[PDB]
Structure formats: C-alpha cells, structure tokens
Amino acid sequence: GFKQDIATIRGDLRTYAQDIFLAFLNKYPDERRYFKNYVGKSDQELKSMAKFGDHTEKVFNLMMEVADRATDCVPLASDANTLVQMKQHSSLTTGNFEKLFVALVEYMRASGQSFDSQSWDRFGKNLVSALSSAGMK
Numbered sequence: 001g002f003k004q005d006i007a008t009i010r011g012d013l014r015t016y017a018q019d020i021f022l023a024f025l026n027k028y029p030d031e032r033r034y035f036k037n038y039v040g041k042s043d044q045e046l047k048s049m050a051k052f053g054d055h056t057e058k059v060f061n062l063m064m065e066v067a068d069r070a071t072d073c074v075p076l077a078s079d080a081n082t083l084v085q086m087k088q089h090s091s092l093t094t095g096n097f098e099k100l101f102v103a104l105v106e107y108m109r110a111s112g113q114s115f116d117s118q119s120w121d122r123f124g125k126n127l128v129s130a131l132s133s134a135g136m137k
C-alpha cells in the first residue's frame, strides 16, 4: 500500500527521485524551463551532475515526509503551505504539481513494482486541492 511505497522509495531515494523526476521532465518537456541548470542535458549527463542528485534527493525526501505525515492520503495543510511559500516555487501554479503527479503515477504503473498507484493519484489530487487552498494560483 501507500505506506509500503514510501518505504520502497526511501530505500533507494536517489534512484527513484532521479528516475521519477526525469520521467516528469521527459513527459512534460516545457517544465524543464523552470530548471535553467538542467536544460540541454541528457539523463546520463544529469545523473553525473552533483546538484541534480542533491536537488532531486531533497525534493523526494520532502515529498516522502509529506506523504508519511498524511492520513489516508490527505496531506497536512501546513505541508501544503510550506510548498506554496517556498521562494523556489513562487512562479508555479497547481498544474505544475498535477503534471508531476501524473508523471509519477504513470512511472509507478510502468515499473516492475507493486506500487499503490491509485493512492498516489489520490494523494496528488488532495495535495493540489491543499496547494490551491494555501493560495497557489
């Protein structure tokens, strides 16, 4: 279930973080414009870029903390507020986050692995609602 998936992701966070983040950028290539250091870099070039690994790790660690603090895939309003108020997110809208969760759920469905994809899609929906409530356009 969803709690086991957090443990699966955390066990190999760097690899899952890098692989899901790349799946996101490759499915929605316009999103790469927000990451001006990752423009014009192949998957293997980014795996060799220390800041890419550090960024993706820090993003997925926070995502897994928000997921673990959720109850029945409902995130805390305080965690949504953190994601809205972050300086690095100031230009974003809820559609950037729904694209990340669409990509994440499709990655999970395609993997060899027994992810609770329906729960990640619900979590993403609930998080988008919470981001909108915390003032994201």
Ligand code: HEM
Binding pocket: 031, 034, 035, 054, 055, 056, 058, 059, 060, 062, 063, 083, 088, 089, 092, 096, 097, 100
């Ligand atoms: C639940 C989803 C997300 C979480 C948990 C998250 C978390 C984070 C964290 C923790 C950082 C700082 C990392 C560091 O200092 O190295 C960060 C940076 C950033 N985030 Fe997000 N983020 C999310 C979704 C998104 C989305 C959908 C976008 C844009 C499409 C985005 C754009 C950025 C950008 C542009 C930065 C600055 C890049 C950098 O660290 O150099 N984030 N995010």
